[PDB]
Design a protein around this ligand. Sequence first.
Ligand SMILES: Cn1cnc(Cn2ccc3ccc(CNCc4[nH]c5ccccc5c4[C@H]4NC(=O)c5ccc(O)cc54)cc32)c1
Ligand SMILES: Nc1nc2c(ncn2[C@@H]2O[C@H](COP(=O)(O)OP(=O)(O)CP(=O)(O)O)[C@@H](O)[C@H]2O)c(=O)[nH]1
Ligand SMILES: [Mg+2]
Length: 169
Amino acid sequence: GMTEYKLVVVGADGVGKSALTIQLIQNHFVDEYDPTIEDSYRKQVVIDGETCLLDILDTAGQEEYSAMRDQYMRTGEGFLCVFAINNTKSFEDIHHYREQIKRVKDSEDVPMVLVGNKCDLPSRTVDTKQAQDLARSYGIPFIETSAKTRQGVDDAFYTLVREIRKHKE
Ligand SMILES: Cn1cnc(Cn2ccc3ccc(CNCc4[nH]c5ccccc5c4[C@H]4NC(=O)c5ccc(O)cc54)cc32)c1
Ligand SMILES: Nc1nc2c(ncn2[C@@H]2O[C@H](COP(=O)(O)OP(=O)(O)CP(=O)(O)O)[C@@H](O)[C@H]2O)c(=O)[nH]1
Ligand SMILES: [Mg+2]
């Protein structure tokens, strides 16, 4: 059949939340840095024989708009928790985003995918093993992505849809 999925892209200011979403939807990489307040995007895609209507919320990394988090977290069904592989602080920030999502939703089980973005970059500070260990401690999938090359992009979003589907049963 046809099912809507409300996905939320969260993470530190500059990890590539907007570039990841724009790459998935519009098939192009945004080199520019345009800070986001809040935008939503749409993509109709077939995943495991189901027509999925992805309703994606691209959120603010700027702490200035942190009061918006409570309402979008209550509304969102699944979360892409994005850090950049060249930014250890953004990797540490995942904990705080995950803690707020679980609390606000009263669900330790919340559909979530850990995303290590900017994998096209050689000067990396967060290794694959560090992120795999963190994802294992959360019991969630870990996917390496590049909004530039499209590496892992479809897999990150489709995996999140599959996590929501599983949670609904
Ligand atoms: C706030 N906002 C986001 N997109 C628009 C553009 N827009 C205008 C009318 C129009 C009708 C329909 C949709 C599709 N859903 C947009 C969307 N996708 C989400 C994915 C996950 C969590 C929350 C959403 C939402 C927002 N819906 C909510 O209830 C809400 C609460 C708090 C929010 O900060 C944002 C939203 C866009 C619309 C406005
Ligand atoms: N090399 C490379 N650069 C990336 C990637 N994703 C994003 N960028 C770059 O990082 C910068 C920030 O990306 P952007 O998508 O705006 O990040 P953001 O997390 O949405 C910023 P905000 O939280 O203020 O909305 C941009 O210059 C963009 O080109 C990637 O996968 N690889
Ligand atoms: Mg943005």
